[PDB]
Design a protein around this ligand. Structure first.
Ligand SMILES: *[C@@H]1O[C@H](CO)[C@@H](O)[C@H](O)[C@H]1NC(C)=O
Ligand SMILES: *[C@@H]1O[C@H](CO)[C@@H](O)[C@H](O)[C@H]1NC(C)=O
Ligand SMILES: [Zn+2]
Ligand SMILES: [Zn+2]
Ligand SMILES: [Zn+2]
Ligand SMILES: [Zn+2]
Ligand SMILES: [Zn+2]
Ligand SMILES: [Zn+2]
Lengths: 476, 476
């Protein structure tokens, strides 16, 4: 068992590993950036124990990126709020500049929801994907959310409001769609989006009009301007002489001919992809599966590539206090990191994992070792009712019963994938959490991430290592 | 303002600092270890903002130790519980071995509360202080709690139950005080305690009997065996031919003759020292003040010293969900770190800050930048009542009013130093939080702390750098 000699050996071996670390002071050819949306440090710890329950290692289990030698902390406050949204943070960790709540790819002069600001090129911030393109290297994005969602949008878009995924959202805020480009338009018509070799995720709805119907579901599109952007995207590649494929299910994705495919657009859902615990495994590719094809495509570029992969529905589950699903989305991303590591050369590939912001998840005591992380922790000594190990500072989990008592979770509740674990402050959708989040890095110049940094530091360091952009560079 | 150019420069300057880092691969003469008891990463974020509210820098403020270049995470699960207590964690980050809940300086074979296990030397784990003393170096402890509390007890005691601070606690568990040494006895009669050059904190009560009265308060002591351990401590130093001083208030501490004082015992309270916001500043020394004198005394030793400093009441305030006080305790420690840095040479002194475990504090949205961290965040969209930025996953803050609604905090509540901010799961004392905590390190071999580690790793690394102990060593 876990006795003196055991813990002494465990520590000495970790010390030996630490002392055996070798710095990689050489250029990064590739950068793969994983983003766990709303994946607080507490989400990681919880997810680790969750994984341990599946492997029988429990609290001794390790998350794949926890094998990396470099971890760091990231300060997420933005230019007008203590607790950032996904838009302003993505602007920060992908374009290197912090900005206001709800804004993407514009600096803090921007007044949210006022489109004029997205017409002023002087306020634009440029993404690490843009910088890779300027250096003549390939780029792509993979996510479990609509591909027009704030996080992936950070790599290409410039909007005064992140809600403007399609033209109908622009119209809804009474701005002029003709001149106010929505995110979906920017992805297909403007740089850097129009040059991405790989685009995968959900959100088909934003790419064709109300008069047209969704492949798969036959749901009317959301566009109100008659544009069929998927066909525009395809026509465009064809006119360049390149080969392009649009797929919308797993079988077709897995069937794509890697060697002969220049551009790949894979949209697997009308909106966000189905959560891990609800998806049809036959029809939807998993995050690791999307990740692997992305890397196969982008890696054909002998000068390198940048790829963003987002485990995005971690956040959505947390907003509903649906912690069981949140942990399942997190492990899907954890497995995609293992997939990426198994396919790339660490002497030339940076793999970085971080979160945009956290969520108010906490891990209460005092269950025994090996207890299922989603289980009860004990019984309150104030009201004599059960309470769970996991709970929230914020969200719809707060529940006062009809007869005026604290809602007591049951066994059935715990297994219910839609059960909302208790919060301290009721809100229809949980707020994010302002606590610093983690960064974990492997590959060239991973040692640029050792201490505590502003969230916008990230891409400046990455550009230095990759030799892209107009900042200081390893190749300078 | 915080515009593009401003964030670009901010990031480039942080990059320039990172690239300028120089590794210190030399022996550590001194090691100063700060322990924020119960100081979760969320506590550190919140304290940072709390500090900013005092200085006018707000979210852009920095915690002193956040200036260190090396930060890491620490996994705090122990041998029987997911969420550790202060006893088993101190055994881990001070003796290098994880152990069971409530046990100090004995391995996991120990059945808590059963004294027999504290008679078996084979089960003993030895502290970093013990290692320093075996190498011929000085040691000391400083804390805001009773000096017999679990945290400082980790540097010297071996007990089957951390409650055994004095003999009356042993008796209370129906063990035999004659053979079961309480922690106060071990501090004064056994090694390594008996050799500490400096001992500061509270807890006088455990050092003299019921028949005797406290200096200052005249409160009867807790001992039931007639022992006057303070006089035993003094007699003992005198008989070695050394000069010793016992002080119990701030003037006397500050009046101590550093050059001619070999041993210093400073007990400033009957129990735990008064919290920051309640203490009489005339009668009680602050954490930084205790820290400075400790350093002044220990640093006379040309071969080096180890010093533990604990910001201990951080925890106690969080148990009561008294977040305002918790933050104030935290900054007292933050200031002590700055004191220690100003006093020592980083080419030869390691300064390391960490926490034993966290608490279930979360930071909710969405207050504007510059809002006081202790203020309201907004109004719930479910019950139309205010909620605070800060709240808890666990504790006594949970409050259902008489008419069966969520308690709505008022302005007066916020200002009240004893107001308990809301929790999600009511409990008389909040539980600790199982989430990984931070480590931040400066000086020689600070770069042994880059990634994610088991909590017991810490002292093994520190021993290697200081060249003490029987593990692998820089000097080997
Ligand atoms: C939008 O911005 C422009 C200025 O560049 C301004 O004239 C207009 O009034 C703004 N709209 C609002 C409602 O703030
Ligand atoms: C305490 O430990 C001893 C020694 O091995 C054993 O004889 C005894 O019954 C234990 N006490 C209890 C109550 O378990
Ligand atoms: Zn987000
Ligand atoms: Zn996202
Ligand atoms: Zn969110
Ligand atoms: Zn503690
Ligand atoms: Zn303590
Ligand atoms: Zn505690």
């Amino acid at each position: 068992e876990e006795d003196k000699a055991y813990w002494n050996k465990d520590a000495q071996d970790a010390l030996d590993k630490q002392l055996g670390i070798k710095l990689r002071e050489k250029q990064a050819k590739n950068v793969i950036f994983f983003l766990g949306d709303g994946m607080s440090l507490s989400t990681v710890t919880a997810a680790r124990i969750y994984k341990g329950g599946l492997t029988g290692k429990f609290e001794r289990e390790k998350i794949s990126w926890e094998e990396f030698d470099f971890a760091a902390l990231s300060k997420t406050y933005n230019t007008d709020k203590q607790v950032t949204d996904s838009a302003a943070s993505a602007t920060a960790y992908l374009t290197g500049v912090k900005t206001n709540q709800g804004v993407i790819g514009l600096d803090a002069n921007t007044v949210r929801t006022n489109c004029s600001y997205q017409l002023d090129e002087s306020l634009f911030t440029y993404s690490i994907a843009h910088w890779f393109q300027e250096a003549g290297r390939s780029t792509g994005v993979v996510t479990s959310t609509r591909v027009t969602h704030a996080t992936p949008a950070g790599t290409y878009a410039h909007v005064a409001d992140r809600d403007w995924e399609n033209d109908s959202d622009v119209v809804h805020d009474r701005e002029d769609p003709e001149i106010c480009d929505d995110i979906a338009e920017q992805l297909v018509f403007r740089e850097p989006g129009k040059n991405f070799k790989v685009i995968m995720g959900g959100g088909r709805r934003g790419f064709f009009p109300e008069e047209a119907l969704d492949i798969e579901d036959g749901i009317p599109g959301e566009r109100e301007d008659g544009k069929h952007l998927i066909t525009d995207w395809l026509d465009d590649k064809a006119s360049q002489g390149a080969t392009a494929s649009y797929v919308w299910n797993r079988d077709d994705l897995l069937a794509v001919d890697i060697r002969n495919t220049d551009y790949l657009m894979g949209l697997f859902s009308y909106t966000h992809l189905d959560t891990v615990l609800t998806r049809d495994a036959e029809m939807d590719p998993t995050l690791p599966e999307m990740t692997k094809v992305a890397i196969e495509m982008l890696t054909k570029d002998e000068n390198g590539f940048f790829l963003l992969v987002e485990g995005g529905r971690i956040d959505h589950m947390h907003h509903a206090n649906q912690i069981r699903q949140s942990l399942a989305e997190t492990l899907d991303m954890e497995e995609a990191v293992s997939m990426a590591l198994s396919m790339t050369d660490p002497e030339e590939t940076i793999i970085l994992v971080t979160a945009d912001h956290g969520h108010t998840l906490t891990i209460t005591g005092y269950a025994d070792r090996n207890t299922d992380i989603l289980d009860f922790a004990g019984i309150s000594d104030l009201d004599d009712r059960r309470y769970t190990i996991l709970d929230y500072g914020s969200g719809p989990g707060y529940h006062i019963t009809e007869d005026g008592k604290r809602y007591e979770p049951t066994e059935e509740d715990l297994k219910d994938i839609n059960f909302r674990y208790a919060s301290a402050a009721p809100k229809h959708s949980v707020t994010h959490d302002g606590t610093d989040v983690g960064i974990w890095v492997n590959g060239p110049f991973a040692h640029l991430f050792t201490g505590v940094y502003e969230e916008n530091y990230i891409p400046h360091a990455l550009a230095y290592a990759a030799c892209v952009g107009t900042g200081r560079t390893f190749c300078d």
